[PDB]
UniProtKB/Swiss-Prot annotation, chain A:
Coiled coil stretches, renumbered: none
General function of this protein: Component of the Mediator complex, a coactivator involved in the regulated transcription of nearly all RNA polymerase II-dependent genes. Mediator functions as a bridge to convey information from gene-specific regulatory proteins to the basal RNA polymerase II transcription machinery. The Mediator complex, having a compact conformation in its free form, is recruited to promoters by direct interactions with regulatory proteins and serves for the assembly of a functional preinitiation complex with RNA polymerase II and the general transcription factors.
Recorded family membership: Belongs to the Mediator complex subunit 14 family.
Name of the encoding gene: RGR1
Protein name listed in UniProt: Mediator of RNA polymerase II transcription subunit 14
Species of the source: Saccharomyces cerevisiae (strain ATCC 204508 / S288c) (Baker's yeast)
UniProtKB/Swiss-Prot annotation, chain B:
Boundaries of the shown chain within the full protein: 1 to 70 of 140
Additional detail: Present with 1391 molecules/cell in log phase SD medium.
TM regions (residue ranges): none
Name of the gene encoding the protein in the UniProt record: SRB7
Subunit structure: Component of the Mediator complex, which is composed of at least 21 subunits that form three structurally distinct submodules. The Mediator head module contains MED6, MED8, MED11, SRB4/MED17, SRB5/MED18, ROX3/MED19, SRB2/MED20 and SRB6/MED22, the middle module contains MED1, MED4, NUT1/MED5, MED7, CSE2/MED9, NUT2/MED10, SRB7/MED21 and SOH1/MED31, and the tail module contains MED2, PGD1/MED3, RGR1/MED14, GAL11/MED15 and SIN4/MED16. The head and the middle modules interact directly with RNA polymerase II, whereas the elongated tail module interacts with gene-specific regulatory proteins.
Main function: Component of the Mediator complex, a coactivator involved in the regulated transcription of nearly all RNA polymerase II-dependent genes. Mediator functions as a bridge to convey information from gene-specific regulatory proteins to the basal RNA polymerase II transcription machinery. The Mediator complex, having a compact conformation in its free form, is recruited to promoters by direct interactions with regulatory proteins and serves for the assembly of a functional preinitiation complex with RNA polymerase II and the general transcription factors.
Location of the protein in the cell: Nucleus
From Swiss-Prot, chain C:
Protein name: Mediator of RNA polymerase II transcription subunit 7
Location within or outside the cell: Nucleus
UniProt similarity note: Belongs to the Mediator complex subunit 7 family.
Quaternary context: Component of the Mediator complex, which is composed of at least 21 subunits that form three structurally distinct submodules. The Mediator head module contains MED6, MED8, MED11, SRB4/MED17, SRB5/MED18, ROX3/MED19, SRB2/MED20 and SRB6/MED22, the middle module contains MED1, MED4, NUT1/MED5, MED7, CSE2/MED9, NUT2/MED10, SRB7/MED21 and SOH1/MED31, and the tail module contains MED2, PGD1/MED3, RGR1/MED14, GAL11/MED15 and SIN4/MED16. The head and the middle modules interact directly with RNA polymerase II, whereas the elongated tail module interacts with gene-specific regulatory proteins.
Residues of the whole record sequence present: 112 to 166 of 222
Remaining remarks: Present with 7598 molecules/cell in log phase SD medium.
From Swiss-Prot, chain D:
One GO-annotated biological process of the protein: positive regulation of transcription initiation by RNA polymerase II
Other observations noted: Present with 1472 molecules/cell in log phase SD medium.
Designated name of the protein: Mediator of RNA polymerase II transcription subunit 10
Major localisation: nucleus
Length: 35, 52, 55, 43
């Protein structure tokens, strides 16, 4: 579980970062209209 | 001649585009060598200051 | 009109300051970054209002 | 690889905001005081 817990936590961080990047891209795409 | 209000709109649009490009570069480049990244960001920040 | 000019200048300075603080938020704790993003937009939106009276 | 990417991007962002704070202090001394508070708001 030790390796499993570290593994799952690092995975969660990874796709949280990926989701943040995608949200940034979506926000810029949406807000380009208001530019 | 170009009216200065149209120039102001062009300037603000260019400023918005420059911020979008700078943040896109930051998002897609964070992680490129640190020295080249820092130099490019210094150039971008100088561009921000000049546009201001 | 000088009041509007100085309001616009201070709003631009505050917009730059808030952009710096928001990118710092993205740097350290991006999970709540949007909490400031729309805020900055409001100032930008206010700028548009500041254009409306100048028309 | 993901952890190394995270650490590298954290270092990059740290240097980004350090340089931006330094230059904002330089060309805009009147906004120097909030900028440090911004660091206090972030760090």
């Amino acid at each position: 579980h030790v390796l499993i817990d570290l593994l799952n936590w690092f995975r969660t961080t990874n796709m949280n970062v990926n989701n943040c990047i995608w949200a940034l891209k979506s926000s810029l795409n949406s807000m380009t209209n208001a530019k | 001649m170009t009216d200065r209000l149209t120039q102001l709109q062009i300037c603000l649009d260019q400023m918005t585009e420059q911020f979008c490009a700078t943040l896109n570069y930051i998002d897609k480049n964070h992680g490129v060598p640190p020295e080249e990244f820092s130099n490019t960001i210094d150039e971008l920040s100088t561009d921000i200051i000049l546009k201001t | 009109y000088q009041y509007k000019i100085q309001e616009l200048r201070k709003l631009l300075k505050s917009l730059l300051l808030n952009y710096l603080e928001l990118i710092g938020v993205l740097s350290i704790n991006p999970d709540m970054y949007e909490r400031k993003v729309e805020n900055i937009r409001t100032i930008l939106v206010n700028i548009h209002h500041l254009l409306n009276e100048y028309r | 690889r993901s952890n190394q990417y995270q650490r590298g991007k954290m270092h990059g962002l740290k240097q980004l905001r350090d340089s931006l704070a330094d230059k904002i202090v330089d060309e805009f001394p009147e906004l120097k005081e909030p900028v440090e508070d911004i660091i206090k708001r972030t760090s």
